[PDB]
Symmetry: D2
Subunit: 347 residues, 4 copies
C-alpha cells in the first residue's frame, strides 16, 4: 500500500513529491481517498518556509488541508462515519469544554492541534482525518467546490455577520478569500457589490465572479468612487478582505452611518484610526471575524454551494491531475497568478 | 381638466370607468401622472364588495394604491419633490405620535387614513399623493416593477424577518404575494425554496419564478415531501403566504426545531393549534408579518429590483393599456388565473 | 457504606425512604455528596404515578434531579472533574452529533437518557452524576440556590428570549417556574412586572418575590388590568408560565403591537386562536421556549444568583433536614402550598 | 415679561447670568417653565470655550439642554401638548428625509439644529421648546431625574446595545456618563460590574452607585484585575465611557473572545490599535454609540427611572436653587468634583 504525497522534507524552501506508505487509521480516525485538494495561504507559507513555518512545523510532514475526500476505511470506535461517506475537513480542532466553547464560540475558541500544520495534511492520494473534524457533503457536490468549503466559510462568516440582501456593499481585497466573499455576497442579494482592488488580474476575477463595480485604489479614490455610486450615502456594508491599513480607513469612510463592518483581513501593524469620526459618530457595528461557526457556517456554505448561486468557476483558475506540477502550482500562486488552485489526485 | 378613474360608484359588486376632474395639489401634496398601477387583494375585495369592504369603504371612490407615477405638479411648500420625479407611494399614512410609531413600528401602527381605501386611489390618469408618502425611484426602473414595490415590501418583511441565505425554506401559497416571496427568497439566497400550492397554474408560475421544489398538498403530503428533501430535518424557515388554516398546521409540522416562521397570509376563521408540540417543544421563533418598515424595507426592495435578481416577469402575467378592460382583469384575478396584473393608464 | 434514598419501589402512588449501598463511579461518571436537592413537577408526576410516569419509569429508581452536590469520587476517563468540585447537574443528556445540536440547539435536541427519569436520581446522600452533565458552581454559592438552577434556566430562557430592561411585562401563572420567572425579570430591569394568578397563595408569593401588580383573572379582567397600567398601550413583553388556554388568549390580547411573547407553560389541549388580530396584525414575535441553552443559560443563571439580585428566598417556602418529612413535602406540593421545596440530606 | 438665563455673552471662558425677555412660542412651539436642568460636558465646553465651542456656538446664547419643564403656553397649532403638561426635551432636533433618519437612525442623524448649542437652551426660568422634541413625563417623576433622562439615554443605548443580564461588565470611566452607565447596568442585571477609574472621588461615587469592584488603572493593572475576578475569562461586555486612549486598549484586552464592546467616550486624537489581536482574533462585536433612538430609548429610561432600580441619588451630587452659584457649579465640575449637578430655577 504505497501512495504519492506532497511533503515538507527539510527546513529549506519547497517540498517533495514523495512515495510513502498509506497510513492506517487509529481510534477516532478515518482514512479517506483524496478526490480534490486546494492550497491556501498557510500551505504557501509552509512552502516558502517563512518565520512562522519554522517555529511550528517539524519536517518531514505531509502538506495541505482543504479536501473533498471519500471515506475508504474507519478506525476503531468511530461511529458516525462509514466507507463511502463523502467528506470535507474542519482543521480548527477546538476546546470542547473551555469558556468560549461552553458558550458555543467555536471559531474564537482555544487550543489542541491544527490539521495539515501540526500533523500530516492531505496533498496525498489518501489522508488520515480525525473523525470529529469531518463534515459530510451531499453526494452530487463537485469535489472541487466541496474543497473550497473552509475558506468559503471564512467568506460566509464575513459576508453575513449581519444582513446583506438589498445592501450596498464594499469589499476591500480580491484575493482568493475576497473573490469567494464576492461570490457569497451576490448569492445573498447584495447590490451593488463594489470591490476595491489594486491588482488588475484580481479585478478581472472580481468582475467575473460577479462584482457590480471595481475600483483601483492606487488609481482613483475608492471613497469618492463609492459616493459616486451610493449618491453620497456610502455603503450599507463594508467587508475587509485585504489587511491593508489604508483600506480599513478608506472603507471606514465609505460606510454609511449606522452601517455594518466585517473585519477579516489581518494587518501588518497597529493601525491609527479616527474612532470619533469613523466609528462612534457613525454609530458602526463592527465585527471581527475569525474561524468558523461550528457547524452553522458549514450548513450555510453547503447549501449556498448546492443552490448553484455561488459563481465559483472563475475563482478556480487552476486544476492539476495528480501532484506532478506541484512546483508550478505553488509558483503561480507565489506570483499572484492563481484564483484558487485544485489538485485532483486520482486524476 | 379631466380624466378617467376606476371607481366604486355604488355599494355593490363591480366598478365603473368614470370621467372626473383632475385634482389639485394642496400644501404638502403633489400631483402625479400615473404611469403603471397594479391590482391588489384588498382592491379585489373592494371590487367584489365583500364584508370587510362594506364595513370600510364609503362610495363613491377611486380604487387602487400600488403606483409608479411621475410628478407633474407640486403643492405649496413641498421642498423635497419636483416636476419630473419618478415616485412610488407608501399607502399607510403616518402616526409619529402613537406609542407604536414613537417606537418605529409603522407596519403595526394605525391610521390617518389609507390610500385607495379611505381616500381616492390611483386607478386614474392623475392622483394626488402626500409628499411624506412618496418614495423616489431610479429613472431606469420600469414602472411595472416600481408598481409592485408595496407588495414587494410585504414579501421582503416575510422573507427577511430573519436570516435566509443558505436556509431551507418552505413557502405555503403561490398567489401573487407568495410568488413575490419566492423571488425575494431566491434573490436572498434561500435554498431549497420548497413550494406548497394546490393550484396547478400557480405551481407552474412558482417553478418559472424560481422555486426549487413544488408540491400539491391535495395530491400528496407536503410534510413528508419536506422531510424527504431535508433528510428528516425539516425546513429552517417556513413562510406562510396562503392564509389556509391547514397550511399553517402543515408548515409548523414541517419546520425544523430551532426554526423560523413568518406568517403573512390572513386566515378566514380562528385556527386550532397544537401549541405544545408544534411551537413549544420545537422552540420556534414565530413572527406575524404585517405592513412595511418605513423605509428600511423600501431601500431593500428598490435595490433588489435594481439588482436584476428578482425574477418578476413570470409574475407579471397580464398588462393592460388604459383601463377599458378593467372588468376582464378583476374577473381573471378572482378566478385565480393571474400573477400580478398591471394597468398602464397612458398606454 | 450505607445511604438513605427516596425511592420509587413499585407501580403504586407514593415513594419509600429506603437504605441502600452507596454506588460505584463508573467510566465518565463521578459521585457526589448531595448537599441540597429540590423537587420539581416531574418528581411530583413520578410520585403521583400518573400516566406518563408508568410508561417511562421501571422501579425501583431513586428519585430527583435538582441538585447542589460535592465531588467525593471520580471514575475512569473523567479528566474535567475532581474531588472537592461543588456541582449542579444538567439532566438533558443531549448529543453534539444531531442536526439540532450541530447547530448548537441543545435545548431542542434529541436526548439520550434523562437523569432522574431513565436512571437513578439525587434524593439520596450520594449520587452518580455523568460528568459531561455537571456544571460547577462558585464555592460560596449556597446549596439551596444552586439546587434551583435548572428551573431557573427555564425562567431565564423565557424572561430573556428578548430584551426586557425598562420593559412592561405580563406574566401569567405564579407557580414555581413563574415565581422564578418573576425574580429573573425584576433582576433584569423589567418594569412594571404584572402578574395574573387565580391562587391567592400564589399572588401573595408573587408580591413577595417582587411583581409590581398582581391581578386575579377570576375576580377581574386581567386584559383591562394591563390596559389600565399601561394606559391602553398593552404590555411589551408577555411570558406564559400557566398553560391555561385562556391565559394564552388574554396575554395575546394585552401585549402591544410589535411586542414579544415567550411560550413556556404547557397546554392541556390544542387552543383555538385568532392569528389575524392577535399575531399577524399586532406583528408579535413569539418564542416557543423549551429546555436550556448549553451552556449560555447556565452562565447567566449562575451569574444572576451571584449578583444577589434574585429574590429567591420567598420562593423556597419549605426546607427539610434529611429525607424524613418527605411525604409531607410531596403532599404540600400536591396541595399547592409550596414555592420550592428543598432537602438538605446532611443535616 | 422678564427672566434670568445663563448666557454665553462673548467668545471667552465663562458665562453671564443676565436678564432677558421671556420668549413667545410661535407655531409648532411650546413655552415651558423650567423646573430642573443638569449640566452636560458639552455645556462645560461651551463654558470653557474650548476648541469645538469656538467653531460651533455663536454668542450671545442661552446655554443648557438637559430639562424637566412644565408647559405654560402652547403656540398656534400644537395639539398633543397643553398647559400643565410635564415634559423633557430631545435636543437632537433631527435630520429629516435623510438616509439615516429614513432607515430610522435618528441617534446618528447629521442635522438639523441642536438645543443650547445652536439656539437658546434652558439655563433660564422659561424656554421655548419644539413640540415634536417634547417628551411627556409621569407627574410623579421628580424633576431632577426627569432632567437626567437625556444623558440616561446615552447610558442606556451604551449599556443595552446588546444583552447584559448576567454579564460580566467592565466600565472604563466613572465620570457623570459613566456613573449613569453603572446605574443602568446594575438595574439591567449585569454581574459583576468592574469599574476602571483614576479619580478617587469618582471611584467612591462608582461604588456608591453600585459597582461591584472598582480599580485604579494608575495604581494597578486593570486587565490583570479583570482577569482575576473573571477567572481568566475576561469580561463579557466592555463599555467605554472615558475617551481615554489607554482605556480603549485595556478594555479590548479585557474583553472575552466573542465579547461585546460599546464605545461612547469621545477620543482626544486618533488611536493606534492592534486590530489583529484585540478585535479580529477575539471576534468582538464593537458598537459605536452616539445620540438616542427616537423614541425607544426614551421609553426605556422613563421606565427604569419609574421602576426604582436606577441608583440616581448618589449621582446627583450638587443641587442649586436659582442660577446665582452657576460659576461654583461649572468650576466644581472641571475640577472633577461633581457627579451630576442640577439647577432648580424656580428654586
Ligand atoms: N480573520 C482571520 O482570522 C482570517 C482568517 C483567514 C484569512 N484572513 C486574512 O484574509 C486573507 C485574505 O486572503 P487572501 O487569500 O484574500 O490574501 P491575498 O494577498 O491573496 O489578498 C488580499 C489583498 O487584497 C488586495 N489589497 C492590498 N492592498 C489593498 C488596498 N490598499 N485596498 C484594497 N485592496 C488591497 C491585494 O492585492 C491582495 O489581493 C489575508 O488578508 C489574511 O490576512 C484572516
Ligand atoms: N399579514 C398581513 O398583514 C397581510 C397583508 C396583506 C396581505 N396578506 C395576506 O397574504 C396574502 C397572499 O395574497 P395572495 O395575493 O398571495 O393570495 P391568493 O389568495 O391569491 O393565494 C394563496 C393560496 O395559496 C393556495 N393554497 C390554498 N390552500 C392551500 C393549502 N392548504 N396549502 C398550500 N397552499 C394553499 C391557493 O391556490 C391560493 O393561491 C393574502 O393572504 C393576504 O391575505 C397579509
Ligand atoms: N416549555 C417546556 O418544555 C417546559 C419546561 C418546563 C416547564 N413547563 C411548564 O411551565 C410550568 C410551570 O410550572 P409551575 O411549576 O410554575 O406550574 P404550576 O402548575 O405549579 O403553576 C402554573 C399554574 O398557573 C396558574 N394558572 C392557572 N390558570 C391560569 C390562568 N388562567 N391565568 C393565569 N394563571 C393561571 C395556576 O394557579 C398555577 O399557578 C408548567 O406550566 C409546565 O406546564 C414547560
Ligand atoms: N459617543 C457620543 O456620541 C457621546 C456623546 C456625548 C458625550 N460622550 C462622552 O462620554 C463622556 C464620559 O463621561 P463624562 O461626561 O463623565 O466625562 P468624564 O471626563 O467626567 O469621564 C472621563 C474620564 O474618565 C476617567 N479616566 C481618564 N482616564 C482614564 C483611564 N486611562 N482609565 C480609566 N478611566 C479614565 C477620568 O476620571 C474622567 O472621568 C465623555 O467622554 C464624552 O466624551 C459621548
Amino acid at each position: 500500500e504505497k501512495m504519492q504525497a506532497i511533503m515538507k522534507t527539510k527546513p529549506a524552501y519547497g517540498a517533495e513529491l514523495v512515495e510513502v506508505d498509506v497510513p492506517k487509521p487509529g481510534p477516532g480516525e478515518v482514512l479517506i481517498k483524496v478526490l480534490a485538494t486546494s492550497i491556501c495561504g498557510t500551505d504557501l507559507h509552509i512552502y516558502e518556509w517563512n518565520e512562522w513555518a519554522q517555529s511550528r512545523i517539524k519536517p518531514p510532514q505531509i502538506m495541505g488541508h482543504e479536501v473533498a475526500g471519500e471515506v475508504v476505511e474507519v478506525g476503531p470506535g468511530v461511529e458516525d462515519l462509514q466507507v463511502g461517506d463523502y467528506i470535507s475537513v474542519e482543521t480548527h480542532i477546538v476546546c470542547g469544554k473551555c469558556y468560549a466553547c461552553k458558550h458555543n464560540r467555536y471559531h474564537v475558541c482555544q487550543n489542541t492541534k491544527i490539521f495539515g500544520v501540526d500533523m500530516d495534511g492531505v496533498f496525498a492520494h489518501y489522508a488520515i482525518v480525525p473523525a470529529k473534524n469531518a463534515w459530510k457533503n451531499p453526494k452530487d457536490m463537485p469535489p472541487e467546490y466541496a474543497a473550497l468549503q473552509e475558506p468559503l466559510g471564512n467568506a460566509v462568516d464575513t459576508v453575513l455577520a449581519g444582513p446583506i440582501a438589498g445592501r450596498s456593499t464594499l469589499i476591500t481585497g480580491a484575493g482568493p478569500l475576497g473573490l469567494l466573499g464576492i461570490a457569497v455576497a451576490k448569492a445573498s442579494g447584495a447590490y451593488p457589490v463594489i470591490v476595491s482592488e489594486p491588482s488588475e488580474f484580481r479585478r478581472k476575477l472580481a468582475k467575473k465572479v460577479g462584482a457590480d463595480y471595481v475600483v483601483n485604489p492606487f488609481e482613483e479614490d475608492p471613497v469618492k468612487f463609492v459616493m459616486d455610486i451610493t449618491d453620497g450615502a456610502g455603503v450599507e456594508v463594508f467587508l475587509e478582505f485585504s489587511g491593508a491599513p489604508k483600506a480599513l480607513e478608506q472603507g471606514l469612510k465609505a460606510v454609511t452611518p449606522g452601517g455594518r463592518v466585517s473585519l477579516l483581513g489581518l494587518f501588518p501593524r497597529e493601525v491609527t484610526i479616527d474612532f470619533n469620526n469613523l466609528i462612534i459618530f457613525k454609530a458602526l457595528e463592527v465585527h471581527g471575524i475569525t474561524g468558523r461557526h461550528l457547524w452553522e457556517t458549514w450548513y450555510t456554505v453547503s447549501s449556498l454551494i448546492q443552490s448553484g448561486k455561488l459563481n465559483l468557476d472563475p475563482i478556480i483558475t487552476h486544476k492539476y491531475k495528480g501532484f506532478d506540477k506541484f512546483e508550478e502550482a505553488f509558483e503561480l500562486m507565489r506570483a499572484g497568478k492563481t484564483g484558487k488552485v485544485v489538485f485532483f489526485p486520482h486524476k
